[PDB]
Design a protein around this ligand. Structure first.
Ligand code: T6T
Length: 393
């Protein structure tokens, strides 16, 4: 009596014409009507939590691979998908580093649908205009700073490197990119304790925020993040940001003339190369009255034919299926060589129910420094203390 309802969230929800085509094909094939709701990234967690707490909303929902599935599963909000995955042809094709991201107490509660890792996204034409070689992007923090300073011309609203400092996950991810590039870690290996209140973590915090505050190579970091910077990049106003394969269809939609005029590279680093893992899974709420049809939709959406067509048309994000990654023409593109080589090393946000609260502490830490309310030393002390209380609660 309830129409099958899917909630699609995050940046990929902008590809609404592609989604409509995909869903219509499903309806034709299965004779099941689908109610679709699309959600922007920045408020999607709060909306999804609101619904799951109430026992209402979707039969199938997007959930971030960055800790949401363990958080929801711990509460009993999600239907287990072990039995379905055991019987599904596709299971052995999902990149294996993705299964821990949707696992709670050795049970899988989500089906990874797209994935990514984070990289330097940069604008070739802007490098060239500044007298830099586009095909030789910065490899180190020192080179990143030099290139960012050389490109920046704030008087003409031109910026070398966009720093995310909003109260959004992008800011945590930005800090993590620099933390791991400095040879630090977010939590201890057993997740019991904060690990970022270290000399490495301080160095990362100071450089990430200095790019915005001292060196002034970013638009206002308190107001803007990765997705804003990608759109500015399409206008040739921001030369470098953190991004990845989801960025590709989106930047090309914003400015079709930018095709071929942007690329990706391993993000510049200090002590160690770093990348962070991301993406979205499909989950079925335990309160759904339509659980079997919801699985049928998940199965269809994560099928070979659907993902082959998606990649053919849109060129991103990265399929969670190995066979599509390997059999599609993605590998012909140099952008994708870099992605496939980096992905297996990408570090994961901790797959624990505490993660969203922890991310909130990292966001606040960065913001308070950017706002001049706290020194990096003061901010990182407080954040780590709060994370340890969260983990001990
Ligand atoms: O694909 C980009 C993305 O949606 O950005 C936000 C992250 O939290 C997600 O995991 C994903 O990487």
């Amino acid at each position: 009596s309830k129409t099958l309802t899917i909630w699609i969230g995050g940046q990929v929800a902008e590809l609404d014409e592609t989604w409509n085509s995909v869903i219509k094909t499903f309806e034709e094939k299965y004779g099941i009507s689908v109610e679709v709701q699309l959600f922007g990234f920045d408020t999607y967690y709060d909306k999804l939590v609101t619904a799951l707490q109430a026992g209402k909303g979707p039969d199938l929902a997007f959930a971030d691979l960055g800790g949401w599935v363990p958080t929801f599963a711990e509460k009993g909000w999600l239907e287990p998908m072990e039995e379905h995955l055991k019987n599904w042809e596709g299971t052995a094709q999902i990149w294996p580093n993705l299964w821990p991201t949707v696992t709670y107490k050795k049970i899988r509660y989500g089906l990874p649908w797209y994935t990514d890792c984070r990289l330097l996204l940069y604008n070739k034409a802007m490098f060239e205009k500044a007298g830099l070689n586009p095909d030789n992007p910065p490899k180190t923090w020192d080179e990143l700073l030099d290139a960012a300073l050389k490109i920046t011309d704030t008087k003409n609203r031109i910026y070398g490197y966009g720093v995310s400092g909003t109260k959004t996950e992008h800011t945590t991810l930005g800090y993590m990119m620099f933390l791991y590039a400095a040879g630090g870690k977010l939590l201890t290996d057993d997740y019991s304790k904060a690990a970022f209140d270290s000399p490495e973590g301080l160095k990362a915090l100071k450089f990430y925020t200095d790019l915005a505050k001292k060196y002034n190579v970013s638009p206002n970091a308190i107001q803007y993040h990765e997705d804003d910077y990608r759109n500015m990049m399409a206008q040739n106003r921001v030369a470098m940001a953190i991004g990845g394969p989801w960025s590709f269809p989106l930047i090309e939609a914003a400015n079709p003339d930018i095709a071929g005029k942007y690329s990706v590279a391993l993000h510049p680093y200090d002590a160690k190369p770093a990348s962070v893992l991301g993406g979205w899974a499909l989950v079925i709420p335990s309160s759904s009255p339509n659980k079997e049809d919801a699985w049928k939709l998940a199965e269809y959406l994560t099928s070979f034919d659907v993902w082959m067509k998606w990649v053919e048309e849109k060129g991103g994000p990265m399929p969670t299926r190995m066979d599509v990654c390997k059999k599609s023409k993605l590998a012909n593109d140099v952008k994708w060589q870099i992605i496939f080589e980096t992905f297996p090393h990408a570090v994961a946000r901790p797959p624990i129910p505490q993660y969203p609260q922890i991310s909130e502490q990292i966001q606040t830490m960065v913001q308070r420094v950017l706002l001049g309310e706290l020194t990096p030393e003061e901010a990182i002390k407080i954040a780590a203390e709060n994370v340890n209380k969260i983990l001990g609660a």
